Design a protein around this ligand. Structure first.
Ligand SMILES: C=C(C)[C@H]1CN[C@H](C(=O)O)[C@H]1CC(=O)O
Length: 249
């Protein structure tokens, strides 16, 4: 029985409408749940879904401790982390990842009727505030960039009061709809919320290209076979079908 650490995040992992009449794994739906099922049909493992204790994906502390689902993996509190867990060079030093099961990049979200046409335009004006989830992969992309536009954006987000950071994707989307705030978020989420809210638009293109991956502790015995199953899923178009099931509505 594999212990899977995860987090509530639309549409990867959600509580079913009538989740109180459910127990254990069957409380939950979504793309990651459907992916787990298909992976489990090939590889024949049982698993139990457990929501990350601290409610975070993963941030390094200055002393070397990781938080979030990354930390749970290093502590061996979970065998797998199944979420929109962005594969980055910093995380790769401290855990293993499967091959990627979805592609994405940093994107900008805003409410319609705007003359903001790009990330350089966004960074070069004062009227519209902008920001991201604190401690996520997108934040650290600006924080460590050598490019001046992104450096200027880091300096702004860092210093602005009141804070331009949000604690969740839900919090950011709400800030977009209700205030003059453009949200720095992964394109997967951008596509999702745009399809459910005709008022939302994308500013410019994608700022990078990345992957989500199943997180595992470093040296995990399960990595090889999960890579073999993900490839079979990829080559049978399963990951794409599932993405359409959860995104296109
Ligand atoms: C906090 C969330 C929603 C996660 C999801 N992927 C990124 C990560 O795994 O860090 C984070 C989002 C972002 O950085 O824009």
């Amino acid at each position: 029985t594999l212990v899977v650490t995860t987090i509530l995040e639309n549409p990867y992992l959600m509580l079913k409408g009538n989740h109180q009449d459910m127990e254990g794994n069957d409380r939950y739906e979504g793309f990651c749940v459907d992916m787990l099922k298909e992976l489990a049909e090939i590889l024949r493992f049982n698993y139990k879904i457990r929501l990350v204790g601290d409610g975070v994906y993963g941030v390094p502390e200055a002393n070397g401790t990781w938080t979030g689902m990354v930390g749970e993996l290093i502590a061996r509190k979970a065998d797998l982390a199944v979420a929109g867990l962005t594969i980055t060079a910093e995380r790769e030093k401290v855990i293993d990842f499967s091959k990627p099961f979805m592609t994405l990049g940093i994107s900008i979200l805003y409410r319609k009727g705007t003359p903001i046409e790009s990330v350089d335009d966004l960074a070069d004006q004062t009227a519209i505030e902008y920001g991201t989830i604190h401690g996520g992969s997108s934040m650290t992309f600006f924080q460590n960039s050598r490019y001046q536009t992104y450096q200027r954006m880091w300096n702004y987000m860092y210093s602005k009061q009141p804070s331009v950071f949000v604690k969740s994707t839900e919090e950011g989307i709400a800030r977009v709809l209700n205030s003059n705030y453009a949200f720095l978020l992964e394109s997967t989420m951008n596509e999702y919320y745009r399809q459910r809210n005709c008022n939302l638009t994308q500013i410019g293109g994608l700022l990078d290209t990345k992957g989500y991956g199943i997180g595992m502790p470093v040296g995990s015995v399960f990595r090889d076979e999960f890579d073999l199953a993900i490839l079979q899923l990829q080559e049978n178009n399963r990951l794409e079908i599932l993405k359409r099931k959860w995104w296109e509505g």
